[PDB]
Amino acid sequence: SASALVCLAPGSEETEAVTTIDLLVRGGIKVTTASVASDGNLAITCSRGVKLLADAPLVEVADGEYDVIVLPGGIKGAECFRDSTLLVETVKQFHRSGRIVAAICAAPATVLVPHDIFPIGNMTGFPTLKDKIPAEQWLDKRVVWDARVKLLTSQGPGTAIDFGLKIIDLLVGREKAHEVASQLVMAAGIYNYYE
Amino acid sequence: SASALVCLAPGSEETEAVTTIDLLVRGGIKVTTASVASDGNLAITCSRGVKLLADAPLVEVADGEYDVIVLPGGIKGAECFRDSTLLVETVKQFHRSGRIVAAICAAPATVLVPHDIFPIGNMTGFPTLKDKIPAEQWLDKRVVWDARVKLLTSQGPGTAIDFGLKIIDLLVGREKAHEVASQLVMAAGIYNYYE
Numbered sequence: 503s504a505s506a507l508v509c510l511a512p513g514s515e516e517t518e519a520v521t522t523i524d525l526l527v528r529g530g531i532k533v534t535t536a537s538v539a540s541d542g543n544l545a546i547t548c549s550r551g552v553k554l555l556a557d558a559p560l561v562e563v564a565d566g567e568y569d570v571i572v573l574p575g576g577i578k579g580a581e582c583f584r585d586s587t588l589l590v591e592t593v594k595q596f597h598r599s600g601r602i603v604a605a606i607c608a609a610p611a612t613v614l615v616p617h618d619i620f621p622i623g624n625m626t627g628f629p630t631l632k633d634k635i636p637a638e639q640w641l642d643k644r645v646v647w648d649a650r651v652k653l654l655t656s657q658g659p660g661t662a663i664d665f666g667l668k669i670i671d672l673l674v675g676r677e678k679a680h681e682v683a684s685q686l687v688m689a690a691g692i693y694n695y696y697e
Numbered sequence: 698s699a700s701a702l703v704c705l706a707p708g709s710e711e712t713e714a715v716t717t718i719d720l721l722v723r724g725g726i727k728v729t730t731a732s733v734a735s736d737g738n739l740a741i742t743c744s745r746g747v748k749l750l751a752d753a754p755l756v757e758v759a760d761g762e763y764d765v766i767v768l769p770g771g772i773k774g775a776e777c778f779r780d781s782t783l784l785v786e787t788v789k790q791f792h793r794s795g796r797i798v799a800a801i802c803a804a805p806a807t808v809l810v811p812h813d814i815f816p817i818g819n820m821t822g823f824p825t826l827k828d829k830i831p832a833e834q835w836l837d838k839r840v841v842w843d844a845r846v847k848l849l850t851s852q853g854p855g856t857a858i859d860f861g862l863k864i865i866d867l868l869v870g871r872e873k874a875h876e877v878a879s880q881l882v883m884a885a886g887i888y889n890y891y892e
Contacts, residue, residue, distance in 0.1 A: 520715040520747055524854070527745040545750070550722040552715055553750035555740065629882065644882070659719070660881035663855060686855035687824065687839070690886030 504673040505532040507568040509589065510556050511539045513578025516548035517659040518606050522572055525666030528682045529674055534568070536560040538589050539582035549576040564592045569673055571596045575607020575628060575658070583613045590617050597652065602672060604654040606665050611635050614653075623651040628658050644692075647672070664692055671695060699868040700727040702763040704784065705751050707734055708773025711743035712854045713801050717767060720861030723877045724869055729763070731755040733781050744771040759787045764868055766791045770802020770823065770853070778808045785812050792847065797867060799849040801860050806830050809848075818846040823853050839887075842867070859887050866890060 506526050510519060526533050537544055537556040544556045571593060573583060583589045597603055610627035611634035614620055625639050626646040645656045645664045656665035671679040679695040701721050705714060721728050732739050732751035739751045766788060768778060778784045792798055805822035806829035809815055820834050821841040839856045840863050842849050851860035866874040875890040
């Protein structure tokens, strides 16, 4: 019954987007993928050339009942998100209606900071873009959850599993996050939610 | 100047396939994705519902000049590979011609073992299918590289980074594998090709 809206744009980082979708589905979360900044076109070419077909254009699903909106990274994809008025207003509406905003890699510095969507929360993002995140908000951690503003952020392609597991934890509970983690053959170092 | 053929089928594990493609492209390797769908369809629905567009049907690219053939997992996609005469003949020709076969998760047990393509050689795969790999060949390692038979295997969605990095090491070398590893924000328990 939990559901997630995953946004995709030309140039989105395909490992970040796809790993997240896969884990959410494994956790029993219903995923809808939406194309952004493509004028309705569902075929999206990602940052390293992987071509994905989205379920719908964002304009058709932005008003749906979702529990979380996910913004993948990739520099060019995040620039498309930043420059889409519909995307920015949808993110603002998710936050004001008490839902979770989840963003990884380039998306925090490129989308959230320029639009002053989260003037107070803690956030992380891709390390070489650290200087784009106000110093008092930056944390250098694989995943950052700020419950005050319901903002989940993470750093890069190699933290996509950490990112997806924390969404599962927040929406359907720690037991399910551990169940999914136990299917993956995760690296040592990544939290598996057993404790 | 290295190149890779990545095979896709209905039910392929999308995190394994996409993470591998992404890392190979970051490493400067040319990637062609080939559909093994029996009717030649290029719009592949993966195991958790992600829709990927392959570049070409396998019959149009199987005789290409590729250094490695990559078989992603996912139990239903691997069954498709197993039951495709062209796929199996192509894997055999890659091996007989001195090239690398790389397989992850369900693909070793489902594709390579029933067809007796590697009667000698160490291999791993998804741990719940360990009993389908002859005991004298099984190792429980994240990645297994047997240079005697040029067989690269790996275990699951969570070892896809380890898998793609080793393909880079073999095709382009340790220096490029470290360069790519350094971009990812990888977890501690994945080898990073630095000493």
